[PDB]
């Protein structure tokens, strides 16, 4: 169905425009010089609060993506017709976005990306 394809395209355009704004909120409070000492998230309250707000945002993105992926699978299972080159929901994002990368997206929504690890995990 073209409908779920449209929803995934709209969701992915919205996600790629919000993600750098969300990461920049963490950088403002959590970034520091690479000095071999504790990351700011270990004890700086405005950094810890920024991480909590990013975690709320990315958790919501993961839940939305899970809903849309299941709708994609339900649609592919109920319809016979195919869309060329489209096997997964990632192929819709790859086809419509500029330099969408599946591993980067999967890492971001699972808090395994460099920004969340380097800014929000204490070490």
């Amino acid at each position: 169905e073209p409908q779920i394809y449209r929803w995934i395209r709209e969701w992915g355009r919205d996600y790629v425009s919000e993600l750098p704004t969300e990461v920049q909120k963490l950088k403002e409070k959590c970034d520091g010089k690479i000095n071999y000492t504790d990351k700011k998230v270990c004890k700086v309250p405005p950094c810890q609060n920024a991480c909590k707000s990013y975690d709320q945002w990315i958790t919501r993105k993961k839940n939305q993506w899970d809903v849309l992926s299941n709708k994609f699978i339900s649609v592919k299972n109920a319809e016979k017709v195919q869309t060329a080159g489209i096997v997964t929901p990632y192929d819709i994002l790859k086809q419509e976005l500029d330099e969408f990368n599946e591993v980067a997206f999967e890492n971001e929504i699972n808090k395994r990306d460099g920004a969340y690890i380097e800014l929000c995990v204490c070490s």
Partner: antibody
Amino acid sequence: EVQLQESGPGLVKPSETLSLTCTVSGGSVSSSTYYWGWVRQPPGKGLEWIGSIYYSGSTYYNPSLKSRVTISVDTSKNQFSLKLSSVTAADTAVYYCARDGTGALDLWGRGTLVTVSS
Amino acid sequence: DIVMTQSPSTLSASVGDRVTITCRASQSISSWLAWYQQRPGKAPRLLIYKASSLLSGVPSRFGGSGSGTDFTLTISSLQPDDFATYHCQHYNTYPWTFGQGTKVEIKR
């Protein structure tokens, strides 16, 4: 399309330092999601991850090399680099630069053979 | 560190055969395992990540399975361009380490 391009000498004398650079083209080294890494494959042997770096400058190194390896990043030149000191012929290998998705290396350079010889 | 051990070291199969490569971890790595293919004169390419997720753009004949310590890469229908060395790699914790590689040769 993002491409990784290695550069640096193919011949290094024993005891000197091997230096290689990876230039990102069609994309940016200033990725808030990815790390950037180096992997090597000595002739007729297995792959060995050397280390990875985040665009902030944070690094992770294989303990097999941590006492003689330095990985750097230059976001103003869209590049990252490797320096391996005190090389021996055991360091002769194909060296690859790679985009490191926190363990899943999803894009690799073509590789550069570096021979350690006098 | 974690040691990854692949088997067999080499295998020969005909076009259309089902090929299986195993990878065993010295300790549990959950599903943090990747499979790479290295075709002649080329740098490796990622085929599978998270033990069973097929990367977009990679042929559907590649599949990954397993969890904990035992993993398998299966090529459901071997093709001539599958002549390559296949490598497993864990990413459970640093350092990332690879198996020794498996060479797949074609019979004709």
